[PDB]
Amino acid sequence: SMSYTWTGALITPCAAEESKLPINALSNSLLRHHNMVYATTSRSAGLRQKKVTFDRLQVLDDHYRDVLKEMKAKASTVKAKLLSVEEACKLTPPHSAKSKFGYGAKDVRNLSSKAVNHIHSVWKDLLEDTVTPIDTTIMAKNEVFCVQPEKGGRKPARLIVFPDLGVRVCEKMALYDVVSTLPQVVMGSSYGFQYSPGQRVEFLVNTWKSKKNPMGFSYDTRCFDSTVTENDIRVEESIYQCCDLAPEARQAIKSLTERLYIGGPLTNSKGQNCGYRRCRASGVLTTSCGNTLTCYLKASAACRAAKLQDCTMLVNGDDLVVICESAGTQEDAASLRVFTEAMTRYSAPPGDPPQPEYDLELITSCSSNVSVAHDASGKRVYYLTRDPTTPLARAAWETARHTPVNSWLGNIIMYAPTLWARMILMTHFFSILLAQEQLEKALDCQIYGACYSIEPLDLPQIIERLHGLSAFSLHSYSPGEINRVASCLRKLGVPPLRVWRHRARSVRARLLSQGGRAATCGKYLFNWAV
Amino acid sequence: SMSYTWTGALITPCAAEESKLPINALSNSLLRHHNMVYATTSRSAGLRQKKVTFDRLQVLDDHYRDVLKEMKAKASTVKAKLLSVEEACKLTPPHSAKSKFGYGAKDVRNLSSKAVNHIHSVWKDLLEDTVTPIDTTIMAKNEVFCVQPEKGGRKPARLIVFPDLGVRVCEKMALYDVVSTLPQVVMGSSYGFQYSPGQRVEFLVNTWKSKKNPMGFSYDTRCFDSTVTENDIRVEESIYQCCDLAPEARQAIKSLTERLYIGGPLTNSKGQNCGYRRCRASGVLTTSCGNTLTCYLKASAACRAAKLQDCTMLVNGDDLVVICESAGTQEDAASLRVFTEAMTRYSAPPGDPPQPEYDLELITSCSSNVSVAHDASGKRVYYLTRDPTTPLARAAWETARHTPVNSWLGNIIMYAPTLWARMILMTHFFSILLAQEQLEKALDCQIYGACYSIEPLDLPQIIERLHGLSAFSLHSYSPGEINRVASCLRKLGVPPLRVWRHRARSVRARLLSQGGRAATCGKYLFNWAV
Ligand SMILES: Nc1nc2c(ncn2[C@@H]2O[C@H](COP(=O)(O)OP(=O)(O)OP(=O)(O)O)[C@@H](O)[C@H]2O)c(=O)[nH]1
Ligand SMILES: Nc1nc2c(ncn2[C@@H]2O[C@H](COP(=O)(O)OP(=O)(O)OP(=O)(O)O)[C@@H](O)[C@H]2O)c(=O)[nH]1
Ligand SMILES: [Mn+2]
Ligand SMILES: [Mn+2]
Ligand SMILES: [Mn+2]
Ligand SMILES: [Mn+2]
């Protein structure tokens, strides 16, 4: 069936949508080719609609059926509980869209009688009505990127579809305990969300080294959420039901699947009907868990169809990496084509055709890749890195326009061991913090699904806990990594690494001069510049 | 061993401790004998120390051993998970004592890097050190009561013992999922915390009616927390371990038991060592679950020792109610004495000797009792009520001194069907809200462990959901109930029920005049006054 059917009404914004990077001095200090940085807006919604709208034809075979039975057997060992209204309220994120029913996320978190009474009413309706399609709002996402001339230049905005806040809290009551435990049990070491960057690296490196002659590939499904069929969503519900659940949870899971997850009406910010969805909604509680289970099921089956040898998979939602034993250059190329044809039959066609890789560093998944450097004693230390283009463009944007969200700080934390986060991001931002006497002001930081209130002076301790002390002494980075960073700097017009090393010595000196926690930042975060 | 051993250092306050009800006009409108209302303070801590300090001698027998094996078998069917630091932070109550380590409950709830880093460090220490006693603070509680001349007049302050905020969050990581599920599985219908007031009434009434010749009694253990022995606390840990838990959770449960739950050093608000505890701490996560399991285990065994017939128990922490088949007047009296002797052997001696009751209304447990009234159609409606002395004294106190906590509102909600909450509390407070134009201002309200932000206009919907529509039309209350309320009014100097009916007609008229939600309050909450 068609992933979407549209009416003609437009996907409208609900506030000011800025698309251009403002000519600012502080930002230009970091990046000069400002015209290459842009943000998506509702203006490009039409383009996105075209690419996410298509007919899905799905043909399953015994490989798929066998994997699904194996998964259900594992799911049958899971026990999960219903969350109470109060627990679901307390776990509601601080800045989610307010309800159309008169209350917002703050009221939910504070257990206001208005929110609590309304949620009880939504829950009761979920149990008593298992068919009426539930309303969802469709919006174009506003995200910052760097133009890619070698392609369509600017990419169109992603479309997010989500139900009202009251329903969102009810989804947690029914499924929070399921989505936070089921994938791990069913997929074991293949469940990517259980890993921190270093633990992800550890699993990838140990897996790579375990093969006699390793071969690996990333698989990029074209518009994954759109490829998810009704059958896929009902298969997900059948896996959830294998768990030992409370009677009300079963009834609510079934109702949410029928009324919301399989599809339903799309309403714009103006209240007009935009169309109908028959694929995955990006904004429901089960999007992550559902996509991970479905990707794992389809890929597991496709590995069997392709007779790939001793496969080990790593799955994060729609992102997939497979490492296996190589059967030879042309054998591998042929087997990957068979793998792709199976994925295509299962309704997960590729965006870019997958390619066999024999160098672990060249495999990119979750926009990241493993790389190697050396610690103080010269020992090899593997770590997770990524192309710094998007992180830098966003850092420049946030430097120019105050942002309730500080992605740059999230990048400094998640990519602390990297050459670019250490030399460019840390230097640039601490320079600013010192100049504005804001070294002690906490900043909101979105990382791994949660919004933290982070004090810059806590960075040393945060990095040590997440990455270990070696993150402060890594050196002798790989040539591929050094070259990628250097190229990105040229492309973006950001000063070369020598300019940053110089700027960092100044920053470090300034930190040491203050002693205390500030000195600690100077000692550990900038030990590399000395 | 001794429940406590003291040093001589005093239990000190940490702020202003008011003990007298201030002569105020608004409050005097409700209650005139203001000198009968008082609040406990650290001044009486010594008296409380005397009563909670004693040697425990415990002798177990096969009845106890058999019940414990039965309990472990049920516990073995429970699976529970570890909460992450972030989940435990989000479930931390908004107003708990700040940490000695530089952050408070707001920082925890907001995932501040300072709180998060510290908690990770406390957790790591729990896993790596399983012996060092953990520090706890001892404080005298400040609570409001009405003098009881027939006894010691004013009761001494209760003593609360609790670990630092960081440890408290770690207790949730290890045990939140266990304490919220294990008791229900082990004890079934006997677990009192699964019931709302009406559901508690339903279980008690159906149980009472199921007996050929019902007999029941409440059992009040003298200073229960002090009677809990080291063996009892280790028995609790052994039950927790029967659950299917994560390896880290097992290690943390064991460490918390050894370092904190079995006992440890007591520090006052001034930092001085006050003594050592070898019994239950009132302020740990496991106090409720632990007390409930232990009370249930000891009482189950004691029912067997006393050969009580077809017993059905209801347990809420240290509060216990038993309903059984009567064996005759003197047979019952004898059997209860045997029951008490068994409880005493198990280290749960009575405060007041239990007495057999053959009238369900006369059994008080959890400071409450079942009573009967009639609905619109004249049908019998059972509901939960209680002596209104404490609720009224507190309502008077809160009327005189603004209080971040509005217990009166919690009482209006929990006891909405009662004659006193409807005629006195609702009338008095809505009268005030109307006069101060605060009918639409939300108020903080502590109910069932959570702090809600309640809007008065939401009361009708709250009461309907919790008690049903009949709560707005109950009439023809029992003579025992009417007499108890009337007597309390005399004792306290609060105007008789006729004065309240008159005042309510005015309040109702004023509400109706406004229409909208206010009119709804007038129609439902005061329909009785017409
Ligand atoms: N602040 C600063 N910017 C620099 C410095 N060196 C280079 N840049 C900037 O970094 C970018 C260099 O990118 P390239 O494309 O390699 O430029 P180039 O090779 O210097 O070319 P020309 O400018 O024509 O000499 C430009 O935006 C420069 O302005 C430096 O020492 N300080
Ligand atoms: N506001 C108000 N208070 C009343 C009214 N009737 C009685 N009270 C108060 O309620 C209490 C009555 O308690 P009792 O001990 O029964 O007093 P009593 O029987 O009236 O005794 P006397 O005052 O000596 O006639 C006193 O505090 C009275 O002031 C009334 O109509 N209005
Ligand atoms: Mn994709
Ligand atoms: Mn992807
Ligand atoms: Mn007691
Ligand atoms: Mn009690």
Swiss-Prot record, chains A, B:
<protein>
    <recommendedName>
        <fullName>RNA-directed RNA polymerase</fullName>
    </recommendedName>
</protein>
<feature type="binding site">
    <location>
        <position position="319"/>
    </location>
    <ligand>
        <name>Mg(2+) 2</name>
    </ligand>
</feature>
<feature type="modified residue" description="Phosphoserine; by host">
    <location>
        <position position="42"/>
    </location>
</feature>
<feature type="binding site">
    <location>
        <position position="318"/>
    </location>
    <ligand>
        <name>Mg(2+) 2</name>
    </ligand>
</feature>
<comment type="function">
    <text>RNA-dependent RNA polymerase that performs primer-template recognition and RNA synthesis during viral replication. Initiates RNA transcription/replication at a flavin adenine dinucleotide (FAD), resulting in a 5'- FAD cap on viral RNAs. In this way, recognition of viral 5' RNA by host pattern recognition receptors can be bypassed, thereby evading activation of antiviral pathways.</text>
</comment>
<feature type="modified residue" description="Phosphoserine; by host">
    <location>
        <position position="29"/>
    </location>
</feature>
<feature type="domain" description="RdRp catalytic">
    <location>
        <begin position="214"/>
        <end position="332"/>
    </location>
</feature>
<comment type="subunit">
    <text>Homooligomer. Interacts with non-structural protein 5A. Interacts with host VAPB. Interacts with host PRK2/PKN2. Interacts with host HNRNPA1 and SEPT6; these interactions facilitate the viral replication. Part of the replication complex composed of NS2, NS3, NS4A, NS4B, NS5A and the RNA-directed RNA polymerase embedded in an ER-derived membranous web.</text>
</comment>
<feature type="binding site">
    <location>
        <position position="220"/>
    </location>
    <ligand>
        <name>Mg(2+) 2</name>
    </ligand>
</feature>
